[PDB]
Design a protein around this ligand. Structure first.
Ligand SMILES: Nc1cccc2c1CNCC2
Length: 150
């Protein structure tokens, strides 16, 4: 009973979280996951500022009201060569990664590891934070509040 959460650097408080290495987070689960990090889904404005500080990914993820990919460098296999905060317009499906926003993070790039999940609640799941440099932090708990998500 195990969940891996792959996390990025923070940029103006905004970071990306991927569950189990694949698109697998619903919009309800995304809000609960950010809440476990003492964070919220970013607004578009928060995401644009993060982009301006160096944030880019190649993965769709939730922000408050849209699903996006922040892009700095044009890449043909990431958001169809677009730059800026690329907004997903048309999709059949409902599960993506998430972005999260932590107001307590540093104002610019913070590429230190994440070593806690401060607002997880009691539960039976082994939750492992995996950083890009491989650094791991594990704890037993739960973050999902909606039964539809388990
Ligand atoms: N960001 C991160 C952290 C740990 C593992 C992985 C990522 C990004 N996606 C590939 C795997």
């Amino acid at each position: 009973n195990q969940i891996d959460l792959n996390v990025t650097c923070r940029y103006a408080g905004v970071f990306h979280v991927e569950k189990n290495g694949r698109y697998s987070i619903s919009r309800t689960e995304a809000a609960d996951l950010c809440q476990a990090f003492n964070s919220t889904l970013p607004t578009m404005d928060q995401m644009k500022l993060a982009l301006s500080k160096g944030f880019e990914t190649c993965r769709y993820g939730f922000i408050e009201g849209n699903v996006v990919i922040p892009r700095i460098h044009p890449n043909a296999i990431c958001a169809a060569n677009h730059t800026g905060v690329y907004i997903l317009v048309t999709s059949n499906t409902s599960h993506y990664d998430t972005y999260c926003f932590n107001a307590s993070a540093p104002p610019e790039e913070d590429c230190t590891s994440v070593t806690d999940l401060p607002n997880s609640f009691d539960g039976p799941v082994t939750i492992t934070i995996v950083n890009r440099d491989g650094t791991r932090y594990s704890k037993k708990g739960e973050y999902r509040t909606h039964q539809e998500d388990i």
